Design an enzyme around this catalytic site. Sequence first.
Site, mmCIF file in Angstrom:
data_model
loop_
_atom_site.group_PDB
_atom_site.id
_atom_site.type_symbol
_atom_site.label_atom_id
_atom_site.label_comp_id
_atom_site.label_asym_id
_atom_site.label_seq_id
_atom_site.Cartn_x
_atom_site.Cartn_y
_atom_site.Cartn_z
ATOM 1 N N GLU A 59 0.821 -1.111 -0.066
ATOM 2 C CA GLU A 59 0.003 0.013 -0.027
ATOM 3 C C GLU A 59 0.799 1.242 0.178
ATOM 4 O OE1 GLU A 59 -1.057 0.945 3.822
ATOM 5 O OE2 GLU A 59 -2.932 1.906 3.428
ATOM 6 N N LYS A 134 -10.367 0.063 0.454
ATOM 7 C CA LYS A 134 -9.909 -0.279 2.137
ATOM 8 C C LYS A 134 -11.218 0.073 2.924
ATOM 9 C CE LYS A 134 -6.437 0.522 5.610
ATOM 10 N NZ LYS A 134 -5.043 1.512 5.357
ATOM 11 N N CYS A 166 -3.708 -3.115 4.746
ATOM 12 C CA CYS A 166 -3.124 -2.491 5.803
ATOM 13 C C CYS A 166 -4.037 -2.650 7.251
ATOM 14 C CB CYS A 166 -2.756 -1.204 5.764
ATOM 15 S SG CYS A 166 -1.600 -0.281 7.049
HETATM 16 CL CL LIG Z 1 -5.477 4.181 5.731
#
Ligand SMILES: [Cl-]
Lengths: 340, 340, 340, 340, 340, 340
Positions: A59, A134, A166
């Site tokens: 990322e 995300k 993440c």
């Molecule tokens: Cl983030």
Amino acid sequence: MRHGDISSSHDTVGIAVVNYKMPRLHTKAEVIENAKKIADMVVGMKQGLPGMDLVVFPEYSTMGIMYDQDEMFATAASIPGEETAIFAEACKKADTWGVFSLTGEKHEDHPNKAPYNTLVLINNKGEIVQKYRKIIPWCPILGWYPGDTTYVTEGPKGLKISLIVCDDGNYPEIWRDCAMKGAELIVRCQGYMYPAKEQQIMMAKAMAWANNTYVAVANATGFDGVYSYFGHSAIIGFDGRTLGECGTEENGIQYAEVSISQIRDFRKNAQSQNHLFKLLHRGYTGLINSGEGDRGVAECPFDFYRTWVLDAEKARENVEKITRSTVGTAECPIQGIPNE
Amino acid sequence: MRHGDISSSHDTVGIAVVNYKMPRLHTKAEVIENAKKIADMVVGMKQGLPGMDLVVFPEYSTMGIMYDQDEMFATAASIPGEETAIFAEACKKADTWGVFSLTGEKHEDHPNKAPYNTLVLINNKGEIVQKYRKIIPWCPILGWYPGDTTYVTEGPKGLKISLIVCDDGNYPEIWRDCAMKGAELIVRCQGYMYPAKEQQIMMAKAMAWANNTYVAVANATGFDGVYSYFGHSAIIGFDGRTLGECGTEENGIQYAEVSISQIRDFRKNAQSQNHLFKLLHRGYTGLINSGEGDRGVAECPFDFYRTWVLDAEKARENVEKITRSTVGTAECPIQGIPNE
Amino acid sequence: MRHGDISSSHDTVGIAVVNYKMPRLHTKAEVIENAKKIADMVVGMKQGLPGMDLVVFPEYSTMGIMYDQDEMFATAASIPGEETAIFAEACKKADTWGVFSLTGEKHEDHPNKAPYNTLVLINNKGEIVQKYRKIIPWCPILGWYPGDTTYVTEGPKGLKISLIVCDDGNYPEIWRDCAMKGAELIVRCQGYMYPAKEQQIMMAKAMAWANNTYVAVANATGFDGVYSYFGHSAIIGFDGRTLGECGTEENGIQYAEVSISQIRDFRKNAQSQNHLFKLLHRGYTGLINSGEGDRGVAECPFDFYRTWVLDAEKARENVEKITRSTVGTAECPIQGIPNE
Amino acid sequence: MRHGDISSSHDTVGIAVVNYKMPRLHTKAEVIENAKKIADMVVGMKQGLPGMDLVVFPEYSTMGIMYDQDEMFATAASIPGEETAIFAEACKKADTWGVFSLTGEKHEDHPNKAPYNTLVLINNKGEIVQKYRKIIPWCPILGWYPGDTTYVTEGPKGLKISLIVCDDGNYPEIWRDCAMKGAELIVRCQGYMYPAKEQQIMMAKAMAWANNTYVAVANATGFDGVYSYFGHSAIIGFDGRTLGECGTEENGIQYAEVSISQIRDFRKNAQSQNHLFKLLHRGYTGLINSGEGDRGVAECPFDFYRTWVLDAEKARENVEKITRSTVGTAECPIQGIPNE
Amino acid sequence: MRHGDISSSHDTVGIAVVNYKMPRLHTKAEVIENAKKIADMVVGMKQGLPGMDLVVFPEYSTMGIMYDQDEMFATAASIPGEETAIFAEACKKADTWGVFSLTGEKHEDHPNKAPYNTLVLINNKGEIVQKYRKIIPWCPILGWYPGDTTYVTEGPKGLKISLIVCDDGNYPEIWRDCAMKGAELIVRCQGYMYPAKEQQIMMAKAMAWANNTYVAVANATGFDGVYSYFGHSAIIGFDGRTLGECGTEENGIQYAEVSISQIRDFRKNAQSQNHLFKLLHRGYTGLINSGEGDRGVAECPFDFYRTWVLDAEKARENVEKITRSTVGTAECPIQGIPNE
Amino acid sequence: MRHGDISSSHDTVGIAVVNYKMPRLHTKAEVIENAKKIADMVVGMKQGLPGMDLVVFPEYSTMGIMYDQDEMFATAASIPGEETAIFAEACKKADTWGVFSLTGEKHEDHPNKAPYNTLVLINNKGEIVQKYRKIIPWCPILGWYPGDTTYVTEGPKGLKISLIVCDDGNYPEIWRDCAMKGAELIVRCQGYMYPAKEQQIMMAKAMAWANNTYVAVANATGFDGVYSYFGHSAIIGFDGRTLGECGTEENGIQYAEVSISQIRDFRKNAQSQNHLFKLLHRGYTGLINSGEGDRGVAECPFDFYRTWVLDAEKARENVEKITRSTVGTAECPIQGIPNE
Ligand SMILES: [Cl-]
Ligand SMILES: [Cl-]
Ligand SMILES: [Cl-]
Ligand SMILES: [Cl-]
Ligand SMILES: [Cl-]
Ligand SMILES: [Cl-]
């Protein structure tokens, strides 16, 4: 599920993960330059890894973190767009699939709403076959508009792939959701800054185990003016054992082969730690021996999940009593994050 | 949250966990004898650990595993009953709380349905304040009737406690459920046999981290005729760092102090890894900056959990397509577990 | 005393340590340029670590190691001086305290005597509140004039701080001296070159434990033409457990929160491993039970320390018989270090 | 300084350390029986370790811990006495030196004052050549009268030996004192109970490094009714690297060869980490280059040690302000230990 | 090649290894009693490990080490004999293959020549299908007559098995020889005493890697009057990664599934670390590109092996100049082992 | 054999190993520039390591990997040549021995046959005293002409040195061959790319142990356009214990002292793990006790080695049946490597 060689076979997907050095960029031209560096890196790696079928970048590896809001807006990408085309060519040239990061991707209402933080899976024909936004951005510091869906995509050699980003990985639910949709590999792309190094190394392994899934993690490295990223990109088996793991070094690479037939043989025949099966057939032996049929129990016996699904506002209220009621805290204030 | 001393203070709960040697028993008289040995051990330990406020024994530590069905039925306990009275006296004498295992506890329809696998929390006045029945028994080999509820109990010095058993811990949902009910310490009692040693060591730590909770694990040790139990009882902080961990040694003990004020200070003021808060306020920074209010998003964006809650049979069917449709497998048959 | 988040609370001091890449510099203008890079880094880090209250840079991080004597003299700093002003502004701007390294600091008789190797603690108002001169320089290779005093300073949120440098840390006495003066955090700044990597990682932890003190270590990284520095900056609890630790990576960062109330609760109430208390109340239980009062014994029962204090020349002579009588050795000669 | 073989040579002392299972004894006859078991074990081990020159048993290995005061008095040994004679015969028979534990040794005013906790070094002729009384008993729980002197004894093959016991090892001063008297091996015998396992493993290594000495640790194992002992007996080089280390297993053994010539070659010729030399020649390079002679500085620059030596009551008062003023704490009371 | 479950599938062999507690026996009747305990243990384990296909017991697990020569002769077994029959019944009853240890096996010239140290592989029909006599006994202490042949046997599910014993494993040649004969699993049974614990743990892994073979190690535990055995039984993949590993605990068990299809897929398709292939096709790329055909070079380029094969006495003489010329050493004498 | 200091003595060779950052070069002028950087680095290091007697650089550290065949030919070195002269001057200036890499060295038939991959040992007078050509190039990707001989050279202070390169080390035979020729230190220079990091770390240690030899490993670091190199340069004792080990950091350095007298004392007097002696005196105790003389057995009992020596084509054929018959595999094709 084996580690050490550069080959791959009809049975194994060769996965490479990259400890990509975090860029510190500011303009669209610099982003494009750096996209091209990534493409060059995919093509080079392939020459050293003839088994490579999937290459995974962290990322933020394309834009870096656009700390400045104006630069964030000016550099937010379309998908498909010029960046993804640059990536697609390298996937075709190197005959690999790839996972690349666009941070930001333009909101539908750009420039009036925050960009998404997005990943794409691009096949060896250069086609985008999964785009994941995300779901749990790394608040408070980072400002991305939250996505709302996970996906499962047939990947190289038929290996079923889901992407997550993440901070998502801290939340077991997401890894569950992807595996329950059929995912055989969950790819976690991160620009995961110090401090939480050992915790993140452990979380991927534990999730691989808990969800009987292959996991691949690509994490950034280096210092970018604000944060230092701790690397430890890795590929992990569905039995919770690391295949290979990088250190903190800039542009480290790891590479492992993940067997299609082994994960399917396991999901079919494992018994004591067939967690996906077991969660929805609880106490089967007991119910059989008590004369209650041979399926065990499927019913959700966890009130948190019942409440979150039926009444998310109540689940929220509940959690605020255990934690706090405002997104910010007066003991550690942050501009634009309300508290008190 | 600190490790090394034998004291405890007004702020800390002194938790002791025991690598109890797995018994191999057969009769009610032998079970009672062994209950008394546990009681004797609590009283002795207290003399060496003056800070001790909570003592934790493994699943099966009282009866061992009753492999023989008839002996299983003949030895299943009432709660309250003679065993718990024996435990209660030791808690009063040593002025500690304790967690003890009754395997089995009589079913309401005993002897015509499988016993439960049960834990009790007994206070320093000898009163049973929580009784937890294992929700996810270790099928296929073990035959306990599944329970259906988690609990949170105000424990020593006000520390909020939930109990879970062995195989439950493989499933992140349970640890989530307890923390979302307010649990500050999740106590996992297990008779966890080889093979899955490193996986279980890692899972407790990862759950402590993911749910911002103290965790205490008591696991059995020794060989009992069938299984060898791998110990590694431990107490773990809410930041995912082990306080202290045993090895595989019979009747190892670990002891740590867990701060009431530290976990509450953390749940209130932590931001980037305040996971309980964050899960129900997703993308708060983004929504603030996009003009959509300051709460983030609470809605469950995971279809697995929506489906499991609304239609558990469909969730089951879904999982059977990924795994298998019968509880047993013809490639590794087990008597009384159907397959094909 | 907890690790993983970027916040800090009224109870915790957020400490950041930096694996600063060792400079290779030669002129006063280059030193000033690099001071400004450090200042820029403090300000950037703060934007990612809103809890940060204390930032710690390695020994030599400002000048690098001035191998050339003339350059050493030409670049030796005044304190206060232009470098410290550059640091002070960044501490004010980022509202943090900081620890910075001046190697050398001008001797009172500069340029006719060797500079000191010096650390300063600068508060969030930009004021120098502690200046520590290294007591045990890393002879033979390094030529700094030895200092002679340790200090304890009230730091952020009241946390009591002492500074020590590199080679000092090999000597348990120094860590004892600071803790016995009241230090709650001993900050060890180092440009600690390979070879002795594991030994230095272990020493900080062991000292944290032995002296019931928080420890923060910032160590340099990279190759500087002569030495390769191994990083592993860390923050360690007073119970000897690492909070967070860097690897060998250039410009790694770690960050942890150290509780004011936990260390004071521990120094007050710990018993078996209250080492600071115990050393000066030896055998208290025994003397009580033998009818000799309830204070134990305070008297120093170690002849080495008695002799070193009363007759340092004799202590020296003693040690020379066990080691050697000249500072140099003919089996490994070094120019300007006498031997034979 | 090498590990792996069962031999020893003219240059190496073969040291064996024993993870002796902690006895639970009550009478003088049981103590004598167990002394004989130790003797039998020395003779057996020798048959498997022909290089063995020194065998080391844990603190409490002969009597166990006499928790009951009356039994403590009734079983306290004379030295020399029947126990040491039993040990001496085994040393002669197996042609080894040995370190054995008498807990208690009769006070000069027995039975009206607490016994000492004592170790003896017995040579291969069965002669007691060192008797060490523990200087820092493990208060509060344990009641031994504190000793006041360390010793250095010429041991097998000329290797200089000092003995220390358990809790002593937490205090760097003791290890310094022995090395400064000439000790080449510091033998630490312990019955070191959980919790502080990792801390004690680390402390021995760190002390070996800090004092440029071989270290051998024998620690008890098993549960004795009160405490569980964590083993990890070990032999460690003077460079801080473990030679061999046991686990937590009952009656584990480790064995290593420690070179006489290597430690002396090192104390003579090491430079950067010749800690014993360096502590009393501080800043030698600097003073040479500043025109102040070639010895560095010997003077003690640590006020704690100056104050402790000249005014122990003031050092005590000082420490009580940082910790507490009474030996006990009302937050964790212990009978016979005063507080408030 | 996967770890964590108790099942096995058509593709995997479920291997169990046992940290068998070392017996201390003296008579044929005691040996038979202990054989029966092993048999009982196989049957019990199977009930907990339904996937188990192969069970592995340590060297000396049946007789212990017969230190006394007369007892050694009186207890030496025939094969087949009463012991193997006792083992065969348990293999049939539990439908597993097994590896068992006979120490000694009668020499052809018994009782006038030393017994062999022997292993047998017994199939699930109770038939002995491999009998291996230790080629490199653990001299000097142990007195077994050396064997001279390795074997490869088709094992459960077709998995090709070779057996080796203890000290053999220190010698890479043996592991090479078995793999070059076709072995897919090398089973190393040992009663491997302290000191060389870490070295033996590492050697098995390194051999698994170097020879692209599964490895299973069963090692004894406990103290037997002379030696303490350090356990760490393990099963290791052909890629050098541990599947599961025991600690030092008595009667620990580990269990893993080793894939038939994975090792064959790897030996066929691996390239960079296909060591068995590569050793006999050296520099293939180079010779292709230099116009010298496409097989690389097969010729042995190591004079040690040429000399050992053609002139073993010269190889011996050579080694004696580097080491010593007599089997014993006067610096560490042992009765019946000549020196000087 | 000791670690931590920068000195060396008459008894110890100070060995430095370098985690040299992998160059990406293309022309002879760039190679020469980089040779000079290495020389500069040797001279600088010496100033920080006065004990340094031997400095070790990775395979490919001079040229990098010449991926392009034309550039490979244009940059292949003569030995002696301009590169080695540049190295020789730095060895004289810094009064050290050194190991340097020439990749390629011109074939005798250059440019019509592939260059060798070569190492040289250069003494402190600048003289080349050993030139080793890699016997097992890292096929398939790398194209070097295979060498055919190992060498042993008297090195600094008389320490006997053999050189090996990278992929050679995977093959135990080579390490055996060098030790059996008398080697006391085997120096392994590598540009060892991810993936096989842990495997290579383990292999060096295991070889040090198996061959009772010091080992020094210098491995490259960084990303070079194709491969990422994982560092972990190390020096390891002859007892299998690491002295010091680097991480993955660019231009890390480790340094250790290896005792001449310790390895010779060990090869002379070690018994149970004197592997070099034992391999050619198998079962000595047994043959003595069976009346068959006191030398044990020397004869090679491994048919693989007999067959490889007498009939290498048959050994090859044998291995092809276990692996594959062509150098390439159609499941992972590589241009110029034939398959099918
Ligand atoms: Cl983030
Ligand atoms: Cl269960
Ligand atoms: Cl210095
Ligand atoms: Cl004590
Ligand atoms: Cl043997
Ligand atoms: Cl190569």
